[PDB]
Amino acid sequence: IVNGEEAVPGSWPW
Amino acid sequence: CGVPAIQPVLSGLIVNGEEAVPGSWPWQVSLQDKTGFHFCGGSLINENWVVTAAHCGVTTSDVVVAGEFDQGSSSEKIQKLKIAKVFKNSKYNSLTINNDITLLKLSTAASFSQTVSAVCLPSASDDFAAGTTCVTTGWGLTRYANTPDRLQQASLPLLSNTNCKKYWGTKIKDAMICAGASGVSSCMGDSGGPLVCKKNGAWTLVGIVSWGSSTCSTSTPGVYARVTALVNWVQQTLAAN
């Protein structure tokens, strides 16, 4: 990756 | 079912949503703990039952708040209804969030009126096509106290599962349906709420807000439990109880 394209939690229960 | 006595104004007046006309999404309810903390949403399907997401972890210690809860006149006509029994779908997968649905049987029937009524359930064979403009509602986060901001509504399109997989890949199961990625998004606090689409004039529950972008990005589609795939289980449960 490279920039803010790496969300860690990219997914989560809503 | 699926017809508000007080018509919603779809242009508006969830991230990037708008305030609903007060009382215009009857079936929308707020699930709160005893302390009064709203933690998920749900939809009334008749006067005695609420349908919500399994991952929400609802118990009989929680209460269902129906009415003009926090929405435009705010603290308005509302009914706090306690829960008598919780029916989690045994096929719920706590890891993939597949089959995200739970039924709540109230101990006390909700009193229906202009501002409280039921959403329509689809038949299992119903076809809700990709591209269809549907609406999702809730008090959930407006950006990833959250006293709910005021009830919001957002118009968004359904996606096909293959188009949804371009973003989410293998996390997408048959029992899920995605919508959005169009400038709006459901978000934390909106789970268990409804994704409704109009079929012949009746708003019908096509999805149950389930999961999505941790960020509630408005260009990533949300994922909802596909009610068409779970409705047979819903019918059996109601007939049995």
From Swiss-Prot, chain A:
This is Chymotrypsin A chain B. It comes from Bos taurus. The lineage of its organism: Eukaryota, Metazoa, Chordata, Craniata, Vertebrata. The chain holds residues 16 to 29 of 245 of the full protein.
